[PDB]
Ligand SMILES: [Cl-]
Ligand SMILES: [Cl-]
Ligand SMILES: [Cl-]
Ligand SMILES: [Cl-]
Ligand SMILES: [Cl-]
Ligand SMILES: [Cl-]
Ligand SMILES: [Cl-]
Ligand SMILES: [Cl-]
Ligand SMILES: [Zn+2]
Ligand SMILES: [Zn+2]
Ligand SMILES: [Zn+2]
Ligand SMILES: [Zn+2]
């Protein structure tokens with residue numbers, strides 16, 4: 001999920017975009 | 022939608038809760 | 043005060059409401 | 064009140080300080 | 085300027101990047 | 106720079122003002 | 127009238143607080 | 156509602172939302 | 186005219202910074 | 215774009231910016 | 245029309261995220 | 274004014290408030 005990927009680890013812009021609709 | 026309902030008027034906490042999962 | 047209750051400890055919604063006028 | 068004074072016009076830091084305790 | 089371009093219309097990430105160093 | 110002065114150390118208001126244009 | 131872009135920015139912060147662990151979908155259109 | 160530690164500006168924003176037209180007081184030295 | 190709800194949200198953040206340890210009361214009405 | 219840890223409201227704000235008119239979903243328990 | 249003061253507050257947060265380590269100058273006028 | 278550590282977006286917001294119409298520069302790698 002997003003917390004594991006972007007909060008306790010770091011999300012690239014491309015990875016943040018995976019959570020867009 | 023949330024923009025139609027909560028930008029035009031102020032939504033209370035209870036009205037905002039509708040949009041939660 | 044609010045810092046002890048809600049910042050160094052956790053405030054429920056009801057506890058945050060104690061700081062409303 | 065603060066809304067009447069600082070929403071209509073931009074309040075400087077000095078004007079905002081009036082509202083502090 | 086950024087206010088003229090990005091307050092009037094919504095600037096995309098790509099348009100915002102113009103203002104970076 | 107600003108990170109060393111104000112983020113990993115503390116900036117007084119006067120020190121923050123050094124970063125204004 | 128309300129600035130939809132600024133309104134939405136505000137709304138998602140409010141939903142973060144209101145929804146908590148439940149999360150939310152933000153679907154503006 | 157979230158169940159988490161709220162400090163500084165995040166605490167103030169939470170009070171703004173929760174308190175509505177009633178307003179609130181933020182007294183950190185109390 | 187200014188959106189009072191968005192304005193107030195902004196104002197209380199500004200008061201947090203300006204008032205510091207003194208704190209403040211936010212009384213919109 | 216920043217390369218840093220984004221949590222809570224800061225993560226939600228980043229999604230709002232990145233996703234634009236498409237919107238997004240914030241599911242913390244997933 | 246858009247509230248420039250609220251718009252700018254929002255814009256600098258967006259620039260923080262977009263610019264990252266590069267930083268930015270915010271020159272409203 | 275607060276006397277505290279200000280980082281990231283919170284530092285940028287503080288500069289926006291403090292600097293007013295003058296604007297500011299946020300250079301984190303300096
Ligand atoms: Cl706004
Ligand atoms: Cl709201
Ligand atoms: Cl934070
Ligand atoms: Cl709110
Ligand atoms: Cl202000
Ligand atoms: Cl944005
Ligand atoms: Cl933007
Ligand atoms: Cl400000
Ligand atoms: Zn890390
Ligand atoms: Zn805890
Ligand atoms: Zn320290
Ligand atoms: Zn705003």
Ligand SMILES: [Zn+2]
Pocket residue numbers: 159160
């Ligand atoms: Zn915590």
Ligand SMILES: [Zn+2]
Pocket residue numbers: 165224283
């Ligand atoms: Zn924060």
Ligand SMILES: [Zn+2]
Pocket residue numbers: 136140172190
């Ligand atoms: Zn609100």
Ligand SMILES: [Zn+2]
Pocket residue numbers: 218219
């Ligand atoms: Zn980190």
Ligand SMILES: [Zn+2]
Pocket residue numbers: 131231254258
């Ligand atoms: Zn934006």
Ligand SMILES: [Zn+2]
Pocket residue numbers: 277278
């Ligand atoms: Zn600190």
Ligand SMILES: [Zn+2]
Pocket residue numbers: 195199249290
């Ligand atoms: Zn302001």
